[PDB]
Paper text:
Furthermore, four residues at the end of the C-terminal α-helix, three charged (K66, D70, and R80) and one polar uncharged (Q77), form the lumen of the channel and create an electrostatic surface potential of alternating charges, which spiral upwardly about the needle, a feature that has been proposed to be important for substrate translocation.
As it is possible that constrains imposed on the filaments by their tight association to the base could result in structural differences, we sought to obtain structural information for needle filaments attached to the base substructure. Fully assembled needle complexes isolated by affinity chromatography were subjected to cryo-EM analysis. The α-helices in each PrgI subunit and their N-terminal loops pointing to the solvent were clearly resolved in 2D class averages of the helical filaments. The resulting atomic model is in good agreement with the cryo-EM structure of isolated needle filaments, except for a slightly smaller rise (4.24 Å versus 4.33 Å in isolated needle filaments) in the helical parameters. The structure of the PrgI monomer extracted from the cryo-EM structure of filaments attached to the base is also entirely consistent with the structure of the monomer extracted from the cryo-EM structure of isolated needle filaments (the Cα root mean square deviation [RMSD] is 0.509 Å over 78 residues).
Numbering used by the authors:
A (entry chain N), B (entry chain H), C (entry chain D), D (entry chain G), E (entry chain M), F (entry chain U), ...: 3 to 80
Write the structure that this text describes.
């Protein structure tokens, strides 16, 4: 069994929270690349790419906060 | 079930708000191409194409604003 | 229900404002073609064709103005 | 009571400043559509439509300026 | 009873301070989507969306300041 | 397979929409050049050349509009 | 009966003082993960996460102070 | 009579030194929340919130210094 | 007597330095709203609104600098 | 004394630089309206109206340049 | 084997997505240069050059977004 | 070796694409000037001068497009 | 049999408590090094590296506490 | 005679080293407030305010260093 | 003697480097205001105003760089 | 044999992980410098330079984290 | 010595490049005004006035380009 | 020997990469100034000036990127 | 003989390592000040000023590291 700590659980709440956003960004970019001027494909790709920016920022900043929570508790052992 | 975030909902309010504007632009251009000098078809195509310009601009600028709302909230986690 | 935006309403105020000017130009040209030297038919066709020129110009320039009103509002979202 | 912020007040100074310019543009276009070649109706509609262009541009650019005033004050909290 | 701390009170002063700004942005966007070229609906949506940007920025930066007030007091226990 | 994007499809809707207008302009000019004073050939060439002017203008202005739709979406990625 | 000393009482005054802050941080993160761009969920999660930082720091620094009170009394037995 | 030591006097010199800064921050935030885009209210709230940051930091660091003065005198009893 | 600290004095040097710029922006916008196409009123409103932008930016950035002066002195107490 | 900043001085150098150009445009238009076919009045009104166009453009673009000079200095305080 | 990272893969999805758009722009410009007034060659070159503009902009802005995704994750290592 | 960049290559594709159009315009104008009423020389000079207009416009607008392609890539380095 | 004392048992509770965290940090860094811009690999490496920081700090501070427990018991033999 | 220790001498070397920098910052801010858009006054105020930031930081960090020199000598009396 | 630090010297290298550019902008604007349509005065004023923009930007950005050089040296005293 | 510690191994996992990214940045810049307007060379250089930024940041921040892991273990020897 | 920068040199290359074009336009207009129907004076004045239009446009657009070259270099100091 | 660092080498790769582009812009402007209406000299000057814009932008943005690479490495010494 | 310790040697390795970088920054700024719009002087000054930033940061951070090496050795005498 692969081990997963508490920060691995917080980082995987976002991974299991979105269903296939890592796939839909890949699929919308592959549909965009075949024809990069259809406004039905650009506006669909903007809304996924702007979503994927806020996905990776809110994931990475939450893990940073719970790091500095624990690093100020663990410093208080001594 | 295909996942759709909040920016996917704002981009799909415009898609469900207009009924078949993506179709009517395609249908009016197909009626125009068969006879590109009828003023009943040019003036009908102008009013749909000028509409479709304001549709894709107001969609794409609204998603840009809600991006910079969230990117100034998520930066305040740390 | 076929969708009609605001520019579709301004372009259709001229269409519903005149009753059958798109028909009377077609009917006067069909009466002219059968006998293209009657001054009762030429002077009746001049007054409809000069009317139909000012109809399509005042329609098409009004839609152009309300386009550049909105394209200078929508540019001010960002 | 419907809430109205400061930018809602600046956008409503222009709305209450003009009396019925949103109505007069609608009324002059309805008088124009019934007879789109009267120069008494075209020149009256030009002066209202050119007014309504400068109304919506000076409204929308003023709200844009007071946005970038506040977004450079609120960025200075942190 | 759901618990609400001091930062929950500062974040809810803005929520109770505006009456229904979270609703009016949703209602004005729903009125905009049905007809995205009416200047009466675009200029009304600009003034609410520019308001909603300054609402979420002044909320999120105030909570950030009171965080760094407390994190420099609580660090002075030891 | 030769690639054709979305603007290539809009420019080829006009090409496939007219059947042989690029040929009929060439054929009517070749019939005109052999005898450039027959009114049956001048009036047939006027109606094709005035058609071919409105064909290339409505093609080239439609591609220009869909360019400025996409260049205002793609600018909103960043 | 599980034993709880004096430092266990000081650490459990904060646990019983907040009602369900350990739950509300978990519940707000679970509501955030399903849709990580709603500003109603980000600003609600910021105010709980900034609260939970000051909860664990003021708990852990208070226990550190009462440790160094007692370790300077108990050193004075000999 | 509620007892107040020497560090209670140093912490209350700042409390009695400012008159109602704990009130003016609360009053300016309540005036800000009703209309969070007035630059007369944002710039008035910035100058009080930046003041209240330097108030709580200079209070909390002064009490920390007089603690480490006394903890290096009291350690010299033995 | 309402208390005013040092940052309150720097923010009020700009308030007392300009005489009635908060009034003249309000008065010029009220004169503009009654007739938003007079170039004598637009060019007078541009010069006040561009002034009021540089007023609130130079006020808010000066208070930010004197904050980070003091927050690097007060951090050096301990 | 009504206050006038630096941009108010640059906008009033053009106002005091021309003597009565705001009056001469008004006076020449009033002489034109009484008899709008005299070439001595049309050619005199063309030279004032073409002057008044270059007056308001060179005024409004100069104030725009000195705005973006100052907004790139004031941004360099922080 | 020449190495290609993740941004090299996103930049090469557009390169492999279009088949020979870098060639067709070169070939249509070479056909245009031999005879720069054929409307069959100008309208074919407009649709490729307007396509090639949207190709290089959507490529270069996508790589910019995935840069600022990663530069806000990698900054959160420390 | 005189250096020639990419825009120098696009501007020289038109120069090498036409053989001696810069010479034929000069030669036809020199034949026209000796006898400026021969219809064999006027109609030959019209077809070269109308060609030379479309040569310098399609050259100068192509270089402008490839400039704004690169200035939107190079802006994305930072 | 290799000997392991009590502090060796406390340091090996963390080693046996995590399964292969010393391996997963090594494996995620080896997957990162082959392509250091994939956000699926950066965000997976952040959550393991922030975990591995809290692993080695909570291990090393626990062994330090049980050292100073024993060094204040063993000093009380004499 | 008012007493001044060694740290009072180091803090007063900077005070006597600059002549009237505490006055010139006050005088340049008073000249700025009367007209906050003159670039001759903004660029003169930037160079004094950026100087006054480096004055108070280099003063306050030097006194901090000579404190931690002495607090590691005085701790070595016992 | 009025004191001038190092940033005062860098800001005064630009002041003494140009001879009377602060005067020539004032003199060319005074010559422009008396006659704002002479192309000999507009093109002379463009070249001075575009120069004065690059003067105040290169002055203000150089002082900003030498500030952040020193603020990263002075932070390394402690 | 040149010695290489553990941080030398982590810094050389990135060096051996990419194959010749230090060479490809040098080679793409040398191809760019010979012709700095080819979009095939700019877009190829953007994707390598944006890659090389994320290479040196993820290398340098990983070495910083493993430094502060070890400096909090080695401090616990005493 | 009157100072002349680089843009003053580019604007004076056109002034010294033409010999007396500012004089010949003045002299040909003075010869035209005495007898404004001589075709030897009209055709001589057309060729100078059409020259003087291209002189002031190519001067004023070149200075605009070298402005936006420098304003994108000077912005890169910070 | 005049010293040249690494950024001096990157800025001189563009200088040695182009052969005499700093000379050809100067030579083409000197040929243009003697006769500023020859289309053989305008179109040759456009292609060099549009080249020289992309030369100085790609030089200045590359040096900016390698600055922010190094300023994020050198910040990680401490 | 003026004394120079070990940190004086590390700070003077950078001083003797660069030849005349303290002079070339002074010389390039003096060449810039005489003509602050030449792109040959701005791009030469950018590459020296960006170099001089990395010179003083890598000098000042190296001396800070060797300070905290020695202050953790010298603390271990007692």
């Amino acid at each position: 069994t692969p081990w997963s700590g508490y920060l691995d659980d917080v980082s995987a709440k976002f991974d299991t929270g979105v269903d296939n956003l890592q796939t839909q960004v890949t699929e919308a970019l592959d549909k965009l690349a075949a024809k990069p001027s259809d406004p039905a494909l650009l506006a669909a790709y903007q809304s996924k790419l702007s979503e994927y920016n806020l996905y990776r920022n809110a994931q990475s900043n939450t893990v940073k906060v719970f790091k500095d929570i624990d690093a100020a508790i663990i410093q208080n052992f001594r």
